[PDB]
């Protein structure tokens, strides 16, 4: 069925930017909370920040609030991650999920769908 597709991940020098995309391989008339998370070795997937159905309420994780910014556009069905002021500590495999319900999209369990995600890695 639906395939979620994350895009824009790179290997950047610290300090710079990123803006990942994450694009549906179809369209829902349903509200889908939607959410980014992240991997790295040694560790269980993060979550990162999301955005309710509507796109009006958003959450980031405390390493990155300030400095990510997540939105979404309908018209393109398409969720970004404007990564700014990166540091070594953001390098991850970066995916994207969509849930049902704005409160658990955070959560590892909480997503229905899930990307097989993009890497993103900043050198010092
Ligand atoms: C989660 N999702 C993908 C989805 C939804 N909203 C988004 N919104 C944005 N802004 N960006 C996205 N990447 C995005 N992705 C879904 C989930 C279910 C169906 C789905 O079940 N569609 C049925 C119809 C039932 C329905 O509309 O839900 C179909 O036949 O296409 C489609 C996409
Ligand atoms: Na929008
Ligand atoms: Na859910």
């Known amino acids: 069925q639906v395939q979620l597709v994350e895009s824009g991940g ?7 930017s990123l ?3 994450c694009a549906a ?9 939607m959410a980014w998370f992240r991997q790295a070795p040694g560790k269980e997937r993060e979550f990162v920040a999301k955005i309710s159905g509507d796109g009006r309420l958003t959450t980031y994780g405390d390493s990155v609030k300030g400095r990510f910014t997540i939105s979404r556009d309908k018209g393109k069905n398409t969720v970004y991650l ?16 969509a849930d ?3 409160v ?14 993009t890497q993103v890695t900043v050198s010092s």
Do not use: F, H, I
């Open 25 to 33: 391989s179809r369209r829902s008339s349903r509200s889908w909370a």
């Open 104 to 117: 658990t999209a955070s959560w590892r369990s909480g997503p229905d769908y899930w990307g097989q995600g």
């Open 19 to 21: 803006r990942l995309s």
């Open 82 to 97: 404007q990564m700014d002021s990166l540091k070594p500590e953001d390098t991850a495999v970066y995916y994207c999920a």
């Open 10 to 16: 790179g290997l950047v020098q610290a300090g710079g």
């Open 100 to 102: 049902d319900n704005y």
